[PDB]
Each structure stands twice: as C-alpha cells, then as structure tokens.
Enzyme design. Structure first.
Site, PDB file in Angstrom:
ATOM      1  N   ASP A  13      16.772   0.606 -22.151  1.00 27.41           N
ATOM      2  CA  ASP A  13      15.389   1.027 -22.341  1.00 27.41           C
ATOM      3  C   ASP A  13      15.295   2.198 -23.326  1.00 27.41           C
ATOM      4  OD1 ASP A  13      12.454   1.428 -21.891  1.00 27.41           O
ATOM      5  OD2 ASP A  13      12.801   0.055 -20.197  1.00 27.41           O
TER       6      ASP A  13
ATOM      7  N   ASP B 130      14.297   8.806 -21.259  1.00 28.90           N
ATOM      8  CA  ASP B 130      13.824   8.001 -20.130  1.00 28.90           C
ATOM      9  C   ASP B 130      14.964   7.514 -19.205  1.00 28.90           C
ATOM     10  OD1 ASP B 130      11.327   5.234 -19.849  1.00 28.90           O
ATOM     11  OD2 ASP B 130      11.921   6.810 -18.433  1.00 28.90           O
TER      12      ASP B 130
ATOM     13  N   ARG C 250      16.076   2.851 -12.772  1.00 31.85           N
ATOM     14  CA  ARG C 250      15.387   1.628 -13.227  1.00 31.85           C
ATOM     15  C   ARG C 250      15.845   1.211 -14.641  1.00 31.85           C
ATOM     16  NH1 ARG C 250      11.657   5.861 -13.448  1.00 31.85           N
ATOM     17  NH2 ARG C 250      11.147   6.421 -15.611  1.00 31.85           N
ATOM     18  N   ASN C 251      16.466   2.144 -15.397  1.00 38.10           N
ATOM     19  CA  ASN C 251      16.888   1.898 -16.774  1.00 38.10           C
ATOM     20  C   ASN C 251      18.404   1.816 -16.911  1.00 38.10           C
ATOM     21  OD1 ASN C 251      14.179   1.721 -17.591  1.00 38.10           O
ATOM     22  ND2 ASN C 251      14.076   3.885 -18.048  1.00 38.10           N
TER      23      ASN C 251
END
Ligand SMILES: COC1CCN(c2nccc(Nc3cc4c(ccn4C4CCCC4)cn3)n2)CC1
Length: 298
Positions: free
Chosen positions: A155, A137, A141-142
């Site tokens: 994450d 992932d 955003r992570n």
C-alpha cells in the site's frame, strides 16, 4: 540524486484472466487472477487492482513507487494494463492482510510467528529507508501474507521520497513525515499483532488522540508481552523522533528474541500450535505450470 532505472512493464489484457473478487472499496476492486505471459508456459497467480483523470494520476503514482521497489519483504508491481480502466498487476498474497490473519487464527499463532513477523516488517521498512522512501501508512492492514511464514509490506498510496491512530505526534500536529515517523507506525503495527488484531485507542475519536499523546498516554501493554517487548513498542512512541529506535536496531532486537520466543511472549499452548506450511497436503483449475511471482524473473 540517483536515476530510477526501474522498468514499467505494460501487460496485454489478453495475457491475464480474473477469477474472483478479493475485496472492493472506494478505490475500486481487487481481483484474484492468473497471468499467462507470451509463449512462456507459466501461470503466475496475481492480484489485479482495478480503478476520472484525477484518480488515474493517483493510481499511476502508486504504480511508480510500487515498480521502484525490490525486496523480499516489500510488494513490487508486476506490471500495469492500459485499458479504459487502468489496472495494477501485483503478486497474489493468498492469506490476505496480517490484521485479519491474527484475528482469524489467534488460537494457532505462537511466539515464533509473532516475533518473525516483526523481524520481516523491520527488514521491509529498513529497505524502504535505504531507498529513501517514507511509507506514511504502515499498519497491520498494509502487511500482506504470502504464506504464514512470509509477510510483505504494501500500500504505497501515501508513500513519498489521514490515519491518525498510527501516526507520530509530529505528523498529526505539523504534517512532518520521516523514517522515524514510520517507526512510530511500526510500534502501533506490533501492538496490533501482539493483541491479535485489537483496534488502537478503541472508542476514542481521532480529534482526541493528539491531546492524549501530548499528556503522555500510550497504547497499553498487551497481556502476552513481557516488559522486554513492550519497552520496544514504548521506545517507538517517544516524543523526540531521534530517540526512537532505527529499523536496523528493530531487526536486531526482534531477531535476538525470535531465537528464544517463549522468553519474550507468553502464550498458553505455544509450540503445540501449527499453521499451514508449503510442506502440508493440499497447501498449494490446472495446477500445471504455476510459478509464484518471486520465482518468475525476466
Ligand atoms: C488499496 O489497494 C491495494 C494496495 C495494494 N495491495 C496489494 N499489494 C500487493 C499485492 C496484493 N495482493 C493481494 C491482496 C489481497 C489478497 C487478499 C486480500 N487482499 C486485499 C485486497 C482486497 C482486500 C484485501 C491477495 N493478494 N495487494 C492490496 C490493496
């Protein structure tokens, strides 16, 4: 293989306090807080992730992976609190996610910062590969911002030993995940930074992505990118996974570029741009005895 001798630290509810809410979604809520251990005379700024027996297993699976990492470019689990809810205690990354950071500060983000972020993500990712950990992932955003000069990958909710527009084609078609499928996601992450937070394949529905990639379509060349930087992104998106760069080569390539940033990224006003540094006034209640998690070791 090798035994995992990582320590899972259990923290008492009374050892920490929730200050405000940082974000809330389907998972539960993330709070800004302070951890004041035993009789240590320290205040560690923390992020508290607070959450059904099924959801408890998933958060305990994230705690397992997060407690097993230790690298300057990866977010570690500080501990867990066993309340009726079950909460993860993590390091406060006061500048939030890199995605919103590039969107909110485009006018002060120069080539040096962009290329250094790429080096740090490649370093964190190469560390995860060393630990035989597939992220599954990786996205802007992570990636969290400790300071504008220091970012970390987080994450671990999908990490093992669906986000379509960041996935390698083998992952979409056959559910195959490798360190080389993380490299594809690394390419998309870089595109996100280089475009100052643009959405990959905006307007295109996730079900059309597989067909688009199969035909040979890829994310476009961001305007600030020289062919040198785009070529790297493009190599991360090769059909043959082994033909893609290795994270250790991405560290080398982006480092050479970070030594002469204006030769690889063309930004109007670059060098005259400035972001907050720990050498700024009012950069850092009672500021007495606060230590960052990276300096608090036991
Ligand atoms: C999906 O659940 C979580 C997965 C782990 N993530 C994380 N790992 C390490 C430190 C940290 N600390 C952190 C997170 C922060 C901020 C400011 C914003 N965020 C995130 C969570 C709320 C919305 C965005 C500061 N520190 N967070 C945050 C979200």
């Amino acid at each position: 293989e090798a035994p995992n001798q990582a320590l899972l630290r259990i923290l008492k509810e009374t050892e920490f306090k929730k200050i405000k809410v940082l974000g809330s979604g389907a998972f539960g809520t993330v709070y800004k807080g302070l951890w004041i251990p035993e009789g240590e005379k320290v205040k560690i700024p923390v992020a508290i992730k607070e959450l059904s027996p099924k959801a408890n297993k998933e958060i305990l699976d994230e705690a397992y992976v997060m407690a097993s990492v230790d690298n300057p470019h990866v977010c570690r689990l500080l501990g867990i609190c066993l309340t009726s809810t079950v909460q993860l205690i993590m390091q406060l990354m006061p500048f939030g996610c890199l995605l919103d950071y590039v969107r909110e500060h485009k006018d002060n983000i120069g080539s040096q910062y962009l290329l250094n972020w790429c080096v740090q993500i490649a370093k964190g990712m190469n560390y995860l590969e060393d630990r035989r950990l597939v992220h599954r992932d990786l996205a802007a955003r992570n990636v969290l911002v400790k300071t504008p000069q220091h970012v970390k990958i987080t994450d671990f909710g999908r990490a093992k030993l669906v986000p379509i527009k960041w996935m390698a084609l083998e992952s979409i078609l056959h559910r195959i995940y490798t360190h080389q499928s993380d490299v594809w996601s690394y390419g998309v992450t870089v595109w996100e930074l280089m475009t100052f937070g643009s959405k990959p394949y905006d307007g295109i529905p996730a079900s059309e992505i597989s067909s688009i990639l199969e035909k040979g379509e890829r994310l476009p060349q961001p305007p600030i990118c020289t062919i040198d930087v785009y070529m790297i992104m493009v190599k991360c998106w090769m059909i043959d996974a082994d033909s893609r760069p290795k994270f250790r080569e991405l560290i080398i390539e982006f480092s050479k570029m970070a030594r002469d940033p204006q030769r690889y990224l063309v930004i109007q006003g670059d060098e005259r741009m400035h972001l907050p540094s720990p050498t700024d006034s009012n950069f850092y209640e009672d500021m007495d005895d606060v230590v960052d998690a990276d300096e608090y070791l036991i």
